[PDB]
């Protein structure tokens, strides 16, 4: 008999300072109606934000899961929750007559943000190559896959959650893997195709407030 | 070709044939005078070695075994024998 | 929506179920470069002027 949309507070979504474009969008939430609170059913919303909407003028095939970790007043302050390639891009890369090489690492940062990265790589048909195939021997695949994992441990274990997200904004991990693996088999379309947040530490507001400037 | 010289094929033909499939069975292997910059003198190694040929008086390791012909450690030159 | 005028530069051939619509590359008279393919009923020849009630639609080429 009544409008539920009458009682929706309009809140701003803030990106952490490691990104360029600050405002993400607007998130309607029902006001505090006795027991259940506006901020209560608002402090776990995922935002699948494209890099092009988030960093100024860069690739638009990378997305970033950012979750509302605390709501001060009118602004929802978000923290990194995951990264993923657009499936349009990811399906464009996976094609025939080349070796799709993948690798995951259950790897943990300095502070207790235990991530799961996902590397991908695709064996490159050469400049003067006439042989259609361009496949890697099983031992060539698992030296690349061994390299993929060793580099993804290196750039995550040694530095904090702020400084791994800044390595995901360029292809700073995917490029170093692509450089190293040229001496094994030249693969070209090398990314970190996904990053999955598994175990967050205890929430510290003072820690989040330094990520927002 | 109906007519060939099966009696007397060219040398370029005979090296383009399997060692067993030659008109007389001849090997592709040879004995080589390998010499290291560790010592002075010449050790006689087999072309298709397959053992880690150590030097005279245990100076170092000359030869690393591979699939076919064995690689020689850089610095160790070789000279193929005649017979 | 403006009721525009186009002109037949060439008829592309007869299309439709019973071949009941001449498929025509029409030429507008606002800009003399902008041209679309359109399905036209009745007898059409080169030179005559059409009256397109909209300039948005296009005929799917056979």
């Amino acid at each position: 008999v009544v409008d539920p949309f009458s009682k929706k507070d309009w809140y701003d979504v803030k990106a952490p300072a490691m990104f360029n474009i600050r405002n993400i969008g607007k998130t309607l939430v029902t006001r505090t109606q006795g027991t259940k609170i506006a901020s209560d059913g608002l402090k776990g919303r995922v935002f699948e934000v494209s890099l092009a909407d988030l960093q100024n003028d860069e690739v638009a095939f990378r997305k970033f899961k950012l979750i509302t970790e605390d709501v001060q007043g009118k602004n929802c302050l978000t923290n990194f929750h995951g990264m993923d390639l657009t499936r349009d891009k990811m399906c464009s890369m996976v094609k025939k007559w080349q070796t799709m090489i993948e690798a995951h690492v259950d790897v943990k940062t300095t502070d207790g943000y235990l991530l799961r990265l996902f590397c991908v790589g695709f064996t490159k048909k050469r400049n003067n190559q006439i042989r259609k195939t361009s496949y890697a021997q099983h031992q060539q695949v698992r030296q690349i896959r061994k390299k993929m994992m060793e580099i993804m441990t290196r750039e995550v274990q040694t530095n904090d959650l702020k400084e791994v997200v800044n390595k995901l904004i360029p292809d700073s991990i995917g490029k170093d893997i692509e450089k190293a693996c040229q001496s094994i088999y030249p693969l070209h379309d090398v990314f970190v195709r996904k990053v999955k947040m598994l175990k967050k530490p205890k929430f510290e507001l003072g820690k989040l407030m330094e990520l927002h400037g | 070709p109906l007519a060939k010289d099966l009696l007397h094929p060219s040398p370029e033909e005979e090296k383009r044939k399997h060692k067993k499939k030659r008109l007389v069975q001849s090997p592709n292997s040879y004995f080589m005078d390998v010499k290291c910059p560790g010592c002075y003198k010449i050790t006689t190694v087999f072309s298709h070695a397959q053992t880690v040929v150590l030097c005279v008086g245990c100076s170092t390791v000359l030869c690393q075994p591979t699939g076919g012909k064995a690689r020689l450690t850089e610095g160790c030159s070789f000279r193929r024998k005649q017979h | 929506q403006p009721i525009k005028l186009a002109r037949v530069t060439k008829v592309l051939g007869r299309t439709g179920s019973q071949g009941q619509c001449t498929q025509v590359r029409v030429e507008f008279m606002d800009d003399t470069s902008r041209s679309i393919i359109r399905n036209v009923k009745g007898p059409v020849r080169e030179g005559d002027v059409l009256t397109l009630l909209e300039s948005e639609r296009e005929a799917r080429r056979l």
Binding site: K8, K26, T27, L28, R45, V49, D53, D88 | - | -
Partner: protein, 136 residues
């Protein structure tokens, strides 16, 4: 339907989850998140016969009824996540998909980013139908 939004040029986004199966088409606008929804009208909500629940016309009526509901709340632009029946079933989106997207491209909604969220299985459960398939 009253936000403190800046009103002139700066767009207010939602994401419309266009799920086009072969027997119905769901035009469903949510926030940037997806957690709070805004409008949802389907093909079968508009046209009252089961065979034309999935017609591109029924999906058009929905996206028109979605878009004019979405302008009352003042969500100006839409991100898009197109979806087929997916899983072990069909990955090709339904006939109502394109007409519904075109319908809120004609209505007055700005179009953000378009992608597929068709639930593609890495490796699937067994599919409905026999060994010998769906005979006709």
């Amino acid at each position: 339907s009253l936000g403190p939004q800046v009103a002139e040029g700066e767009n207010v986004f939602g994401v419309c989850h266009i799920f086009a199966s072969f027997n119905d088409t769901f035009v469903h606008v949510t926030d940037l998140s997806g957690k709070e929804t805004i409008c949802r009208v389907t093909g079968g909500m508009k046209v009252k016969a089961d065979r034309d629940e999935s017609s591109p016309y029924a999906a058009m009526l929905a996206a028109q009824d979605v878009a004019q509901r979405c302008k009352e709340l003042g969500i100006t632009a839409l991100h898009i996540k197109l979806r087929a029946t997916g899983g072990n079933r069909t990955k090709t989106p339904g006939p109502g998909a394109q007409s519904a997207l075109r319908a809120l491209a004609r209505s007055g909604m700005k179009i953000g980013r378009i992608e597929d969220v068709t639930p593609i299985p890495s490796d699937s459960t067994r599919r409905k139908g026999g060994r010998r398939g769906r005979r006709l």
